[model samples]
Target chain A: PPYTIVYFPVRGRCEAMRMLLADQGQSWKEEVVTIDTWMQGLLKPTCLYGQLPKFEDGDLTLYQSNAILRHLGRSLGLYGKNQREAAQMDMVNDGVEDLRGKYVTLIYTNYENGKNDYVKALPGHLKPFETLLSQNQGGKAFIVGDQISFADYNLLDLLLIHQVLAPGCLDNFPLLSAYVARLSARPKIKAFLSSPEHVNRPINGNGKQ
Target chain B: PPYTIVYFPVRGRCEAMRMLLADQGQSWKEEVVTIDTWMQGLLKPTCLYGQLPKFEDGDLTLYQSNAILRHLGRSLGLYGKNQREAAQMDMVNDGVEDLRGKYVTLIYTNYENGKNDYVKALPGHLKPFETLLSQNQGGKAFIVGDQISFADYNLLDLLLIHQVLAPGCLDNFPLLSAYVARLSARPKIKAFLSSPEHVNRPINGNGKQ
Candidate 1:
């Protein structure tokens, strides 16, 4: 695969795409961005939004994490089984983005003070995912439709990282807890999750997540 | 067209979709949720994410305003003329959403104190779109390809509402200012923007925008 991701060494926004690539059994390269390298301001001008985690699928260059993930999902056939399922996939993805956006703010902007409030308000943020699972085939598996879509991988990363932040946030959402367990048990992902490479990289900078 | 939107009376998330419908020569109905009705929890429990802006295009019921917009764009031939343009369109829509998501938080949650900070930081978020405009056709026309994509309608509405939030915010970005002016002059969109149905609704619930 000529697919490449340009992002910081930390998982950050690119983690979901990394998980999907691993799960799909695809090989991709990472053009890591270091603060030392970014200080030059060379790449900032090159990126559309002066953001990281740019993507390349073959010859196509793209920015925007969600756009990159959705593109990869479509190319990998993990979007959904049909157009209706695809629509639901996007909805679930959007919901993940919503909560993740909040989490990003909590970590980067207000970690020390906002943690308590964030954890307290977390159930409201997560109940919808539970509802998604509850309504899909009687809450058997996956976030949307019957099969695992790109959102499942993203949701898995989300659940795992939140566990580090709020600890027991998903204990109340049984479906999400089990869903994380199920996704974690997959060979490629299980391997990736526990590997020294992944464990060594904290989910965020500044001794958090 | 049997299109229906379920959302609160606030023209927050659904306005962009409504703009698209209006500009594309499509008429749709709204099942507006009112606080008076919502206090009793009529539809709250049933919503996928405990949020409104649910949409139905014929039999395809969906949630997430962006998902519905992209679906409409695909169905209405507003996504793009090709896959490349389609990808670019996704970038623009996501950029619109990235800023809008933050704006939503400011309006609904932190308006009292965060307003000034948000306004101060506004240019950083809006400038990417300006740069994008500058790159494409030398800031001549649409955000992506030769034709209008769903992203254009969403971007137009974003710039429109942001002006309401921070008057003359686009003044510094010549390309963006001209882009807004050009899009605002479109006949159908012009008609919709000035129509009583659109002009009367508050952009937000608190009446700030």
Candidate 2:
């Protein structure tokens, strides 16, 4: 039997993991739990740590999204090969998560009135990514080394979410915009994005505004 | 030569790693860089990834507070004996981090006003911990298996900080209160807390006004 991945059907929190799995071309069973169907008692039994994005492979089970991602990244060879590069990749990934947290705090707390503040803070946030991208790649290849790593995939996902919500947001940061576009245009990532299951919809992507 | 830990003198971000080191009874060099000193070129070469709590062991360098903690924890045998326990420990550790973030938002932002939002939320925030402690030990030992783990040390340190900040904050949860008291009373931990380098000031040991 294939390993079972249990999560809500929505892509809100589970998409990144899905993307990572797809990037690695790993074949596993996805068990989507809906409120009416799975929330009754199914969750309590299978959820070892009592959290979503739980992966069960026979006797081995893993929880925590980042830990799961790290395992998948290592297994799929998406995380850098060496310890140093892997640590660096984690730093960058967590840094993006921090930025995402700020965005959520700004946008979702009071969406109508928060947009102005979020827009104002957008440049400051985008600038750091621009600097990192420009300095790291100089408009050449990827985020980390010569090849595409988890960082690239994460950045692409972040940018896609940003663009879908705020179309012109990245216009000022041309290098970052181009970098994200380049990553998105990759064969595997492109296929994943265009897939019907991963299609984007209107939502309040900005958290702080 | 011992590993060098470079971070702000305060225990704010460096406590967990410090506890990890202390629990091992290992002696390492400490460089407590202040903001003034840090800006004056004292911290330039020390920050490998341009961040605090960077660890330098021989020629190897690492950054990120949690990553550093994990590195030290694994080295000290505090992480876990196997991958399963390691993931479980990480879940609790990261869960603490999430709670800490929420605490910071409530406490630091409204610090000047001395608002007690986090203090008030302490009961609910710590209740799960009480359950975990009870279940993990089955009323026998630490948060993990028999021996003390980084998770236990971390929980002790955090709870101590709260105690110093707001006395009787954990009084309602007697099990947690007693648990922290026991951990605090550990000889090495006691020595570390009493050391001039550590924050020796009384947390909210005084009864609430």
Candidate 3:
């Protein structure tokens, strides 16, 4: 297989990669691990980083979601055309990661008490992306460039999931609202969004959002 | 200027990059922002991500510590020789980042009461790095390859800080101990480690470690 993803059934960290593959029309295999299997301790011990979303590209195996995304970005030419652009992509990806960290913590650790606070502060967390988009191609193109980058797929998934967490979160940022709508309507992305693998899977293991 | 680092007075997130630049024999300027200046809110709103460690490489400016590191790595030939090695570097960097996040929280938020538990759990957090080092070149070389990488500098800073947090933290990991010793003895790094800029600066803002 060209690519294989070994992870839990939930869409937690691997969904962005799935979106990338779908948008690029690439095929991959998934070896979904059930919670029982994960709890058995054998697999956890073998994982280099003791975590899931282990990705294999043919003979090569990798751990860490960002590593896998970078590999795919480099191979698929979704990184950037130049070093400057690539750095910009990295900046956007890092911001997304920072926000996602807060989102994960809220969903798993403090959803009951922290939901309202998280929703309230989300605009501040999101304004940077909107600012980034505004500076690039008049807020009409992809995050960093006119061509789609791997960060785009990741950011799109992030924004979509936030919408689920807070229904009208993007309402305040016109560029972000339009960006999500535009990216979500891409033919392959639309198909992937509606696929059973994405639709049926829980966004998180804790069953919050 | 070839490169300039705009950050707070403390080492904090910029130390690793400083170490990398110093060890590589690169000269750069620093624009240190005091807490008073930062509190003025003039520059905070101008920041892309509303944080410090803004790096300028010639005419290009970038935010996010990892993005700057990756940019430096790519430009300085410290990334990797091939895609596989690059992905490995990314994995190690991400792991370091995950550990760094916990360390930051422990320092800034839970230092008073959480010190004991953090020190107790330190070994588990460090074992992965030891294992990674052991798997690569008999632990005689850098984190991912024979040559030092951007991640090696980052990981080196991470280990050094942990030692300050918990003395003899690497006692059980022989390879890690020797690796740190070897890297620290490098002539340029030795000089930088002893310089006023490095030695006088606090590791963090709160003066914990």
Model 2 regions lying over 4 Å from their true place:
A1-9, A28-63, A74-77, A127-142, A145-151, A168-175, A200-209, B28-63, B74-77, B111-117, B135-141, B145-150, B165-182, B185-187, B200-209
lDDT of 1 by residue, B76-155 (tens): 88877766777788888998888887888898899889989999999988888888888889999889877878999899
Please rank every candidate by DockQ, starting with the best.
Answer: 3, 1, 2
Deviation in angstroms for A69 in model 3? 0.7
Best by TM-score: 3
Interface RMSD of 1: 1.4
Give candidate 1's error at residue A197 in angstroms.
Answer: 2.4
**Cα lDDT of model 1 by residue, A93-120, tens digit:** 9999989888988889998899999899
Q: Rank order by TM-score, top first?
A: 3, 1, 2
Model 3 DockQ class? high
**Proportion of true inter-chain contacts also present in candidate 2:** 0.17
lDDT of 2 by residue, A33-90 (tens): 6667665775664454456777775675766666666555655677775665655676
Ranking under lDDT, best-scoring first?
A: 3, 1, 2
Per-residue lDDT of model 3, residues A70-92, tens digit only: 99999899999999999999999
Using lDDT as the measure, name the better of candidate 1 and candidate 2.
1
